[PDB]
């Protein structure tokens, strides 16, 4: 686990180099973004229960065969384990958003998650549908004003969409 600032230092140390002036200014504008990054993380954790339980409700409506007897999410424990995995992935994606780096997300959330779902028999293509339903439920909740000053957050919301896409290809 290393953030976006330590990712630059880890690359410079293997070269034996100081950080040049064009690299410090690329890091001084990450500080300038700053408050806009913490506004995104505040908005996806304050609604973190609503992101999971709405995207789950919209996933068994499109795929009703998951909750039929014989489906992978039919029982009390198999339904609660379905909502559990979505909260874990959403937890680690917000860790990578506050870090600026997807290192913590694939260190300890995505390593072996694909081979876990093959062992259990869980359809990993339907798990990817659930990550994408949590993606746009939190992308749309990032770019609404609602107590924030007006400005451009377009590069940070594109960064947050990249973590949801990385988790959705590392699962199937």
């Amino acid at each position: 686990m290393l953030d976006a600032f330590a990712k630059v230092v880890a690359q410079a140390d293997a070269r034996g180099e100081f950080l040049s002036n064009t690299q410090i200014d690329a890091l001084s504008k990450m500080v300038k973004e700053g408050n806009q990054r913490l506004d995104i993380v505040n908005k996806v954790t304050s609604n973190a229960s609503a992101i999971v339980t709405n995207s789950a409700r919209a996933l068994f409506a499109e795929q009703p065969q998951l909750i039929q007897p014989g489906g992978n999410a039919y029982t009390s424990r198999r339904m609660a384990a379905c909502l559990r995995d979505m909260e874990i992935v959403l937890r680690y994606v917000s860790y990578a958003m506050i870090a600026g780096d997807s290192s913590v997300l694939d260190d300890r959330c995505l390593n072996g998650l694909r081979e876990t779902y093959q062992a259990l028999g869980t359809p990993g293509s339907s798990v990817a549908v659930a990550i994408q339903k949590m993606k746009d439920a939190s992308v749309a909740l990032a770019n609404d004003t609602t107590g924030t000053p007006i400005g451009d957050c377009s590069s940070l919301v594109a960064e947050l969409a990249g973590y949801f896409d990385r988790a959705a290809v590392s699962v199937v």
Partner: peptide, 26 residues
């Protein structure tokens, strides 16, 4: 997609290894 099993991502040791002493990763 993901780093090899066990390797902490972004903290590999073969980063700037020269060719004359590079070890192929099993």
């Amino acid at each position: 997609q993901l780093a090899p099993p066990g390797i902490p991502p972004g903290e590999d040791a073969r980063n700037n290894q020269s060719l004359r002493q590079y070890v192929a990763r099993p």
